[PDB]
Design a protein around this ligand. Structure first.
Ligand SMILES: CC(=O)N[C@H](CCP(=O)(O)C[C@H](CCC[C@@H](N)C(=O)O)C(=O)O)C(=O)O
Ligand SMILES: [Zn+2]
Ligand SMILES: [Zn+2]
Ligand SMILES: [Zn+2]
Length: 420
């Protein structure tokens, strides 16, 4: 499931006042520098004139399984391609985006092994390697709005190289001269883009780097190219590895699975047991939202993994059940104050809470018990933090607990309490 997300000026009229960039990553699922950068770009930047269209992850199924490409290398499917290829439709969607008349330039992000050098030094540093280089298929594209690929590349490279963390990380130009014999790159995305008279570029971050460093360089390259294109932008943070790491590991990130409440991405217990998921729904079809763009669910044996890029945030041991949407809100007392709490809410609790009984609805407070029934009703109990078995918390910090409602063998929804 790849989506395109626009990063545009607040005022629609400003869209045509500067060029348009198509920014792409995650065509290969084990290159997280690229799709973490597109993610952070979407979450923390603003484009003030022109437009940046972003496909944050082109190959999401492969991303979810930390795999270069489940159905082959998707970046070899832009030339000859059989209609029966499972990715044939995705490729047409990608081509269609690339070929839009509003698009001027294309930037395609990758992580690559070793460090590219224009002459052979050793097994890690040589022309066959891909890390930390800026790539063009040829030095010019006649017919393009911006035909001088070489000049844009050199200047972007100079911009990146002003901010090296270590000298081995210096960027070099890699012109693959694709039309002159590079049969593999002849099948790849940027060459397809060149043939639509777009100014196309790929940026590589070395797989030898830590993710934060890869994303740092990818963002340098994005900013460098936006500067060349004169697409003005802002970000709400300072571009250094420390800030990038902090934003990747942002504790305000959340995931909302189906109609369940938002759960934090970070500091979940490694496994969440008896986790209710909708009856007879394919995992890729379970709605999932997040304030990040690279979150998803994927089946693994009898578990369902919650993924944030290539990162495994938790293992769900599901409980497949009918999601009855009839129950919209529940009467709860929170710290002595009676109130209606919408199903799928997170409520903060300082001292105590109490669930009011409902006629045909039972409530299970996960981590609280009075008897030992396999289908209990724990409405009518005044509950404090000291009443919880802490190991049933969603989080390592032992502060967030599930309340699960049932209307006779159907799941009526869930509310989380967070003790603050
Ligand atoms: C097997 C293994 O891991 N190979 C990898 C290969 C690393 P890459 O996938 O980033 C290298 C190139 C980039 C194409 C650039 C340009 N023509 C474009 O279309 O964007 C590719 O897509 O094939 C590695 O060495 O790390
Ligand atoms: Zn921000
Ligand atoms: Zn790649
Ligand atoms: Zn030339």
């Amino acid at each position: 499931s790849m989506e395109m997300i626009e990063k545009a000026p607040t005022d629609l009229e400003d869209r045509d006042k500067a060029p348009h960039l198509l920014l792409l990553a995650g065509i290969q699922g084990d290159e997280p520098g690229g799709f973490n950068a597109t993610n952070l770009f979407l979450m923390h930047y603003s484009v003030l004139k022109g437009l940046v269209e972003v496909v944050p992850v082109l190959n999401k199924p492969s991303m979810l399984r930390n795999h270069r490409g489940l159905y082959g290398d998707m970046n070899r499917k832009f030339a000859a391609l059989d209609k029966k290829d499972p990715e044939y439709p995705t490729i047409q969607e990608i081509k269609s985006l690339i070929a839009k008349p509003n698009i001027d330039a294309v930037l395609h992000l990758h992580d690559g092994g070793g460090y590219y050098r224009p002459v052979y030094v050793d097994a890690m540093l040589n022309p066959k390697r891909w890390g930390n280089c800026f790539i063009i298929d040829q030095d010019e594209v006649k017919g393009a709005k911006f035909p001088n690929l070489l000049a844009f590349a050199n200047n972007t490279i100079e911009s990146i190289n002003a901010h090296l963390l270590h000298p081995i990380e210096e960027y070099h130009l890699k012109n693959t001269r694709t039309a002159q014999g590079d049969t593999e790159m002849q099948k790849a995305l940027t060459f397809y883009a060149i043939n639509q008279k777009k100014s196309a570029f790929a940026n590589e971050a070395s797989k030898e780097l830590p993710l934060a460093s890869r994303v740092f360089y990818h963002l340098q390259a994005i900013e460098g190219l936006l500067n060349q294109l004169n697409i003005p932008f802002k970000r709400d943070f300072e571009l250094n590895p420390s800030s990038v790491h902090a934003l990747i590991n942002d504790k305000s990130l959340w995931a909302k699975i189906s109609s369940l409440p938002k759960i934090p991405l970070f500091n979940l217990r490694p496994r969440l047991n008896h986790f209710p998921l909708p009856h007879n729904t394919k995992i890729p079809q379970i709605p999932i939202e997040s304030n990040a763009y690279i979150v998803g669910l994927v089946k693994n044996k009898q578990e369902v993994f919650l993924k944030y890029g290539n990162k495994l945030m938790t293992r769900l041991s599901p409980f497949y059940i009918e999601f009855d949407p009839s129950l919209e809100e529940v009467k709860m007392q929170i710290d002595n104050k009676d109130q209606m709490v919408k199903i799928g809410s997170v409520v903060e609790v300082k001292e105590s809470f109490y669930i009011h009984a409902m006629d045909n609805i039972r409530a299970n407070v996960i981590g609280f018990s009075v008897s030992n029934e396999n289908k209990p009703n724990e409405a009518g109990y005044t509950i404090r933090f000291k009443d919880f078995q802490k190991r049933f918390s969603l989080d390592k910090q032992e502060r967030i607990y599930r309340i699960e409602f049932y209307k006779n063998n159907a799941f009526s929804g869930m509310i989380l309490v967070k003790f603050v």
